[PDB]
Amino acid sequence: GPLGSRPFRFSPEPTLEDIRRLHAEFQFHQPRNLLLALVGEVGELAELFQWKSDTEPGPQAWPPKERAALQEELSDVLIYLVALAARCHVDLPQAVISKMD
Amino acid sequence: GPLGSRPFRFSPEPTLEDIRRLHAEFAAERDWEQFHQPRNLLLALVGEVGELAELFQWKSDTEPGPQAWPPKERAALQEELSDVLIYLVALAARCHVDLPQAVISK
Amino acid sequence: RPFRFSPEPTLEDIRRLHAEFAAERDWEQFHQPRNLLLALVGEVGELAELFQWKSDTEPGPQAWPPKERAALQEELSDVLIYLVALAARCHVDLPQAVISKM
Amino acid sequence: GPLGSRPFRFSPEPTLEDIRRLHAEFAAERDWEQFHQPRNLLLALVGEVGELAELFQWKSDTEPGPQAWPPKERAALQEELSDVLIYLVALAARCHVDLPQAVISKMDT
């Protein structure tokens, strides 16, 4: 019915290419520095779930404030991941295809 | 000159959404959804982040750069980078977070 | 004065000290394997942050100024404590798993 | 009963200092001190944390549980927990941080 279960989907933009072009528009962008920075954000992301066990409600039912924190940490991880991949000259989008075979 | 010249770029596709749907299909087709719970995907991502760090662990800061890494290492790097990306996408989708939008927002 | 770790506390001391700090707070419900594992990943992240701005220059962390060294000690010990807590929750004898690993 | 539970405890040794020495000896024998710079050890630690995370990734916490896993898995667990501790010890030492003392200092507040 009209009140439930629309499928979840991502917006079509920005794309991985757009995201990279945005990062460079914003030294310390050495591979290991970006890798360490990624690890730090992955840690932030993990902090949000550490005490969130089975006995509790999942992320799509978390309070708007909590969800906002989740969107931020997920975002940070992606940003450094794109930056790192770019820096390494790895065609990230393609790498995903050259994988699934 | 007409030599080592290539303004590195990402291909215009797959898009993050293409990657999501792509991975969603691959899973639904194998009945993997049961494993795709948030903490599971989070821990899977951490596992892949560990694999990626392994490629850089003994690599010095003054060295050439991943760009100049032998081909076998460059291939491993491609795989791990994209392994981490796939799980990050799976995790955001499972949490119903529109990743692309959260990044421009960020 | 050659560098060394102090003789104690030991890993067992650490396990004990942590086990009591939490008990005196009724935190046992929070010490489930995956919870502790994720908390540990969280601290490894804090530790990583102290080094992303750096580079392995000859003068290492040993020459880091006071505030930065206090921070490194803190994050390092934060990681160790959750690791100890995780091992205990898993009934893994960490000290022995180590020697038996050589 | 006789087949019921019992208090869990770590062995009295090796100590953290003992572990630092054993690892130092190992890197000495194989000549790895040159690769054991702080950032290398951190990233190596991150790698082992990844190995450890893999053992738990598809396991719920309301499931059998580690103290009940198959011996082969419990063996892998022991190995990965050890790997994380070893690099942690190595990173600390390489940074001249008295790890045990840092714990005490922490507990003081």
Swiss-Prot record, chain C:
Catalytic activity annotation:
dCTP + H2O = dCMP + diphosphate + H(+)
User: What's the record's note on cofactor binding?
Assistant: Probably binds two or three Mg(2+) ions per subunit.
Query: According to its UniProt record, where is this protein mainly located?
Result: cytoplasm
What GO terms in the biological process aspect are recorded for it?
A: dCTP catabolic process; DNA protection; nucleoside triphosphate catabolic process
Compartment(s) of residence: Cytoplasm, Cytosol
Superkingdom of origin organism: Eukaryota
- Asked if Coiled coil is a keyword of the record, the answer is no
Q: List ligand-binding residues for Mg(2+).
A: 43, 46, 75, 78
**Outcome of residue 53 to I?**
Reduces affinity for substrate and catalytic activity by about 50%
Q: In which tissues is it expressed?
A: Ubiquitous. Highly expressed in heart, liver, skeletal muscle, cerebellum, brain, and salivary gland.
The entry's keywords: Acetylation, Cytoplasm, Hydrolase, Magnesium, Metal-binding, Nucleotide-binding, Phosphoprotein
Cofactor(s), names only, from the UniProt record: Mg(2+)
Query: What is a single cellular component term in the Gene Ontology annotation?
Result: cytosol
Question: Which is one GO molecular function term here?
Answer: pyrimidine deoxyribonucleotide binding
EC id:
3.6.1.12
The UniProt record gives the binding positions of substrate as 18, 27-31, 53, 82
- What controls how active this protein is? Inhibited by divalent calcium or cadmium ions.
**Changing residue 18 to A does what?**
Reduces affinity for substrate and catalytic activity by about 50%
* Thermal profile of function: Optimum temperature is 60 degrees Celsius.
pH dependence, entry free text? Optimum pH is 9-9.5.
Protein purpose: Hydrolyzes deoxynucleoside triphosphates (dNTPs) to the corresponding nucleoside monophosphates. Has a strong preference for dCTP and its analogs including 5-iodo-dCTP and 5-methyl-dCTP for which it may even have a higher efficiency. May protect DNA or RNA against the incorporation of these genotoxic nucleotide analogs through their catabolism.
What's the subunit arrangement here? Homotetramer.
Q: What is this protein called?
A: dCTP pyrophosphatase 1
Query: What is the primary gene name for this protein?
Result: Dctpp1
Q: Specify first residue, last residue and whole-protein length for the fragment.
A: 21 to 122 of 170
